[PDB]
Amino acid sequence: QVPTRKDYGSKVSLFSHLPQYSRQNSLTQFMSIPSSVIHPAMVRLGLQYSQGLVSGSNARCIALLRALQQVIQDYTTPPNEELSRDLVNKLKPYMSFLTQCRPLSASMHNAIKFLNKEITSVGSSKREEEAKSELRAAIDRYVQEKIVLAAQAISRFAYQKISNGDVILVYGCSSLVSRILQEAWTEGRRFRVVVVDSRPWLEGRHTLRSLVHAGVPASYLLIPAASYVLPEVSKVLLGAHALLANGSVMSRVGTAQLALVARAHNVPVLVCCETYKFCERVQTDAFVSNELDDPDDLQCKRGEHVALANWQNHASLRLLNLVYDVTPPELVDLVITELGMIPCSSVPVVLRVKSSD
Amino acid sequence: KELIEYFKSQMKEDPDMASAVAAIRTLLEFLKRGLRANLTSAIETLCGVDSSVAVSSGGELFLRFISKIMIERGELFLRRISLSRNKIADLCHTFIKDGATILTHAYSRVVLRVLEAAVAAKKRFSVYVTESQPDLSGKKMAKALCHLNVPVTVVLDAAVGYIMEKADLVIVGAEGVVENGGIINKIGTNQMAVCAKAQNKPFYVVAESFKFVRLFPLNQQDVPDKFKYHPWVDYTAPSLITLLFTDLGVLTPSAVSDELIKLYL
């Protein structure tokens, strides 16, 4: 059986209901080396989630669908049982193990929902390997269109907005915004990018390398220098991880802050999100549902005087590094999807017209 | 009426001269002829011609400042008023950055003085002048600034919300300053200040010290009707104003109330 991981450190009194684990210890210390309860591709996926090797919001969904292809390929049918019920009952502890490794992104939630809807609608007269081929082909078509065709459509719809001679501000690491910047630089736009990064992940270095390798002139700075440079910045690109029912933008933790400071400097912000990453779930703060990272990650070496080394010996000391927040929907201007340029109030509209209604 | 004739002779001989300066010079000329104070009181009861706030404000401040040393008192008072504008330019022109986009209201010699002091310090900037048309005076401002060899663009009156996002600072010369820090000016100041506040642009007021009137309007109707006359006069809230530029220094809008409490009307 799969046990629960022990909560690490002293939690925030506002975040006592949310789990906070550590990357030092693993859950597979008390599991079999031939993976029998959990699928071996699923425990491989949980290891590359828990150690932080797959951090992008689209990369988690791609690796999730590849592991689901490896599970469905390694699926067998018992006697007098249907695939459309047994696969539903078997994939739930797999997703529970993946949730206990690392909290799921909403892209992965909608991927689980779409796969459950597809394996629910498999007919009883279909054979074993024929339904396996149908499910693998459905996953392949799904990842094919709703990654690369939506990415090309959002790239063209943002290419027809970015003009010549402007400056663009980005935050965090996202493959969609970086692909927009690369395909805007290659097709003829001449611009420079101000890259805003934040602690302790420091994931802005990835898109910094991606913009220098693409030939784009780049500028690198942090959250406090964004207030210094936004009087010169005319355009802000952002990478959204989830869009809610009210039009909120779930992204990295420095998103609503940067959008508020950009509106204070009259700089329009632009989030870029594909339509499968939407939510019928809604929240208004970063407190009722959020991911808790490592409390040992906030420490750094400024000289030889690391102060947060023995932070657990102080009883009145709390360590917190939030992953997700939400934006109020009156702060974000663009929502660039593959259907066209929509505002934030059109997210449940696109949910309705893409939910067969 | 010899007082209005002397006022017209002092105001029409120099078109670049203010009206309140000529009014206080007319009061001093009546003080040259007690009988001099009675003649000054008679002409200041008889000077009800100009509807500007600065004229009545300077008249009230000279009526307090007068109360054999009255002639020399008015003499160095007019010396301070005449030497005010150089201190205005020298204290105000240090804020304009290079390559900035200037937004300017209708014609006044004070903003022309600070722009010629700004180009005197080797600065390059573009100026957007609102046309401000109950009468074409912003065109006269753009003509007088085109002779200054600075890039000026005649802007339509209903485009101050159109060009606010590209004009980084808004410098407007006012013709009358009430106690709390608000200003009484030409009718298009209120919409420009509201569009600058909605676009977070710093709204600067460049006015002298004799324009400190002891009034307190709450609404657009609470300004007096004798200064209104299609109105010519609006009111700007002091929360919409960043700084003021007087001869006593670059002042926050809460400093005018301090000066008027220390002056006691």
Side-chain angles (χ1 to χ4, degrees), chain A residues 1-356, chain B residues 6-8 10 14-28 32-34 37 42-44 48 51-62 64 67 70 74 76-78 80-86 88-108 110-121 123 125-148 151-265:
Chain A
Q1 291 84 17
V2 175
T4 61
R5 294 178 66 186
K6 296 183 290 294
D7 291 331
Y8 182 75
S10 296
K11 291 182 180 180
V12 179
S13 179
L14 295 178
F15 293 99
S16 66
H17 66 281
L18 293 173
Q20 184 178 3
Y21 304 112
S22 178
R23 291 179 182 176
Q24 296 298 109
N25 51 1
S26 296
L27 183 56
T28 64
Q29 291 178 358
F30 295 99
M31 292 178 69
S32 296
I33 300 299
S35 297
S36 178
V37 176
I38 306 299
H39 192 272
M42 286 299 168
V43 70
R44 184 181 296 273
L45 186 66
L47 263 64
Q48 66 183 356
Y49 283 169
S50 65
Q51 293 181 357
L53 295 175
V54 178
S55 296
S57 179
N58 290 318
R60 292 181 69 193
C61 183
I62 291 170
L64 178 67
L65 268 67
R66 294 293 185 271
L68 287 165
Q69 288 178 355
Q70 295 294 321
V71 168
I72 294 170
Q73 186 178 2
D74 200 0
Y75 182 78
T76 186
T77 301
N80 67 19
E81 292 292 328
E82 292 86 4
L83 188 147
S84 296
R85 184 176 293 171
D86 197 2
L87 187 61
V88 175
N89 289 117
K90 193 174 77 172
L91 287 174
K92 292 182 184 293
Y94 292 163
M95 304 305 108
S96 179
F97 179 76
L98 292 173
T99 305
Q100 290 180 356
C101 289
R102 190 173 186 268
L104 301 178
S105 65
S107 65
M108 294 178 68
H109 289 288
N110 290 319
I112 290 167
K113 184 177 180 180
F114 182 76
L115 188 65
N116 195 1
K117 183 175 73 175
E118 289 293 327
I119 68 176
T120 305
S121 178
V122 176
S124 66
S125 66
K126 295 179 182 179
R127 294 179 65 88
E128 181 179 0
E129 291 86 4
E130 198 272 332
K132 287 168 69 176
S133 296
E134 285 185 353
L135 292 176
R136 287 180 61 87
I139 292 170
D140 286 329
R141 289 190 298 271
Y142 179 73
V143 66
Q144 182 68 40
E145 63 182 0
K146 209 170 266 78
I147 292 297
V148 308
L149 294 176
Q152 289 178 355
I154 291 172
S155 179
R156 290 183 291 113
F157 289 161
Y159 179 76
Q160 67 182 358
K161 179 62 70 177
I162 298 168
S163 296
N164 295 113
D166 55 354
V167 291
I168 296 170
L169 190 145
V170 297
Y171 177 73
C173 182
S174 64
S175 66
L176 182 62
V177 178
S178 296
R179 186 175 178 178
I180 287 169
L181 292 173
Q182 288 179 356
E183 293 182 355
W185 182 257
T186 56
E187 290 293 327
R189 297 292 183 184
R190 296 291 185 269
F191 58 92
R192 64 179 177 88
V193 180
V194 174
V195 176
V196 175
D197 199 359
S198 65
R199 295 188 71 251
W201 291 273
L202 295 175
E203 65 182 2
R205 279 82 179 271
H206 293 171
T207 186
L208 185 63
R209 291 181 181 92
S210 179
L211 287 170
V212 175
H213 292 171
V216 180
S219 178
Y220 181 77
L221 50 92
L222 294 174
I223 300 296
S227 177
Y228 178 73
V229 299
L230 277 169
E232 292 292 327
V233 172
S234 296
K235 186 179 263 77
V236 172
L237 287 176
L238 294 173
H241 292 170
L243 298 181
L244 299 178
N246 55 3
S248 296
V249 179
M250 291 181 70
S251 178
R252 298 292 183 184
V253 63
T255 301
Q257 180 177 359
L258 182 63
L260 182 65
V261 178
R263 185 174 291 275
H265 293 286
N266 293 318
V267 188
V269 294
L270 285 76
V271 301
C272 297
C273 181
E274 298 185 356
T275 60
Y276 70 100
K277 295 168 72 175
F278 293 165
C279 294
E280 69 271 14
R281 184 181 61 84
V282 65
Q283 65 181 356
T284 59
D285 55 351
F287 295 94
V288 298
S289 178
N290 196 357
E291 184 179 1
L292 297 176
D293 206 77
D294 293 333
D296 291 331
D297 202 3
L298 286 83
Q299 63 182 357
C300 66
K301 187 176 180 180
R302 296 292 184 269
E304 290 179 353
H305 193 273
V306 178
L308 294 176
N310 297 114
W311 62 272
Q312 292 180 356
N313 295 115
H314 295 285
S316 66
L317 186 62
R318 296 291 184 269
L319 270 295
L320 183 63
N321 45 2
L322 297 178
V323 179
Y324 294 100
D325 60 346
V326 296
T327 67
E330 68 271 15
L331 296 178
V332 178
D333 291 331
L334 269 303
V335 173
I336 301 169
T337 61
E338 69 268 16
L339 294 175
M341 295 178 185
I342 65 168
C344 294
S345 65
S346 297
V347 178
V349 175
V350 179
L351 282 170
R352 186 181 67 250
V353 303
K354 295 295 289 183
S355 66
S356 69
Chain B
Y6 183 75
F7 182 76
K8 187 177 180 180
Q10 292 294 322
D14 194 1
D16 293 331
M17 186 177 177
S19 297
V21 180
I24 300 169
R25 288 178 67 89
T26 304
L27 291 170
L28 185 65
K32 291 180 182 179
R33 292 180 181 177
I43 68 159
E44 75 183 3
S51 66
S52 179
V53 181
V55 177
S56 296
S57 298
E60 183 67 28
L61 292 178
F62 184 76
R64 183 174 175 85
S67 178
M70 186 181 289
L76 92 158
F77 182 74
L78 284 169
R80 292 292 298 273
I81 295 299
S82 296
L83 271 298
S84 178
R85 292 179 183 269
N86 296 115
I88 295 298
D90 290 331
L91 268 296
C92 184
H93 75 282
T94 62
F95 286 172
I96 293 96
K97 291 177 70 68
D98 291 331
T101 302
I102 301 298
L103 179 58
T104 306
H105 198 72
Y107 181 76
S108 66
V110 190
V111 67
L112 191 147
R113 181 66 59 85
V114 72
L115 289 179
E116 69 183 2
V119 303
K123 292 181 181 180
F125 54 90
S126 296
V127 181
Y128 288 164
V129 174
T130 304
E131 61 182 3
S132 295
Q133 292 179 356
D135 51 352
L136 277 75
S137 65
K139 183 176 174 66
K140 183 173 72 175
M141 181 65 204
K143 189 261 183 181
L145 190 62
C146 184
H147 188 273
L148 191 145
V152 65
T153 301
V154 176
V155 179
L156 185 63
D157 198 4
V160 298
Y162 182 78
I163 65 169
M164 190 63 72
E165 66 185 4
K166 63 182 74 175
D168 51 353
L169 75 159
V170 180
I171 172 169
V172 172
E175 66 183 1
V177 176
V178 298
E179 184 174 358
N180 59 0
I183 60 169
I184 293 172
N185 203 0
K186 193 174 174 67
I187 194 67
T189 306
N190 205 170
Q191 61 183 359
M192 186 179 288
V194 170
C195 291
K197 182 61 69 178
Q199 294 297 109
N200 297 115
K201 299 296 188 292
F203 182 76
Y204 295 104
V205 170
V206 186
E208 290 89 2
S209 65
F210 64 94
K211 294 180 181 180
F212 289 163
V213 67
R214 291 295 302 272
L215 294 173
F216 195 84
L218 287 171
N219 290 319
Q220 299 298 109
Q221 293 179 356
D222 290 330
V223 292
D225 292 331
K226 63 184 181 294
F227 296 106
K228 291 182 180 180
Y229 295 98
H230 297 285
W232 293 89
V233 161
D234 58 351
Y235 178 69
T236 300
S239 66
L240 301 175
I241 296 170
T242 300
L243 286 171
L244 277 78
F245 297 97
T246 63
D247 55 354
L248 295 174
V250 178
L251 295 178
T252 184
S254 67
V256 178
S257 179
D258 194 0
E259 293 293 327
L260 289 171
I261 287 169
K262 292 186 286 184
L263 186 61
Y264 293 103
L265 189 145

